[PDB]
Amino acid sequence: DIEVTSSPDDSIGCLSFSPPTLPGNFLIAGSWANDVRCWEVQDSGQTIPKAQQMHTGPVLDVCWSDDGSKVFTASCDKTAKMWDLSSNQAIQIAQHDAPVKTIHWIKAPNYSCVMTGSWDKTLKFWDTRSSNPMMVLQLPERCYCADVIYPMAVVATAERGLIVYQLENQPSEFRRIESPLKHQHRCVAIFKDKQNKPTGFALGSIEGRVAIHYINPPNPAKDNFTFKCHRSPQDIYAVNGIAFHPVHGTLATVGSDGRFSFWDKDARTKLKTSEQLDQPISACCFNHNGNIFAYASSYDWSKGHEFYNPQKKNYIFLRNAAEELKPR
């Protein structure tokens, strides 16, 4: 696949393409060297570095604003920033008492805001101009991952905590869910129904397993399930990321096995499994129309510090894999 020119210097945690509101395609990557980097992508597959910004700590999540003018950055330095791309100046918009692991834009009919989720077991909501969070919600444990598609948010915590929120008028807890997964939670991603309404989510575990959860299906015991993935004595690797093709509703997973795989949760099939890379695949995402699949190959720490080679190269790869994720 296609390599991004001028990759980050340490391991990449997060990737986020630009919204449909911008012409073309711009990719954002966060890294363990504390940087957020923005590459323009062109139909040729060539990529152009456009701008960068740095935290005083590793960058754990990133996301855009729906109009495309801002990039949001959440970092181990216990803050998050709003980066205005035009002026190329960034300011702090959020403060936490611990690293900020997740960050998301909420475009609702009555309010817009940034949602940050932190290892300080809090969930904060920000208007981007006030130093005061407009809302603070308490988590049972430390935030490990989340995803947002109005009017729904999902948040997984440590101790297999798993919560769903409603976002109409103002955010508020909707229901706590007994986790379907037996092991540590790492990734999550919301999927939608035929009517384009958020309807459930897929949940990745460290135990080579993904759970599909519908919020309100007719027969939960049949309609909800878990499948095995990212295993090669069978070896079991962690699942580091998950994303739904924005058009087909199929999905991709990437795991510490250094592979990626495509899936159809309605047919319950594996559509594709790539070959093994040198390193674990630590993140991934789709462009706004699903014509581009982007994944990052970096050490994820899934075997401790001893196996960390800081002189090994960190790669972001691009794949035009729209057809490979169509179902039959």
């Binding site: 399930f225 499948f227 319950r268 594996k270 559509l271 594709k272 499994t273």
Partner: peptide, 10 residues
């Protein structure tokens, strides 16, 4: 890249 059925947990 052949399409197989998922290894589901039973």
């Amino acid at each position: 890249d052949d399409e197989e059925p998922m290894e589901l947990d039973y």
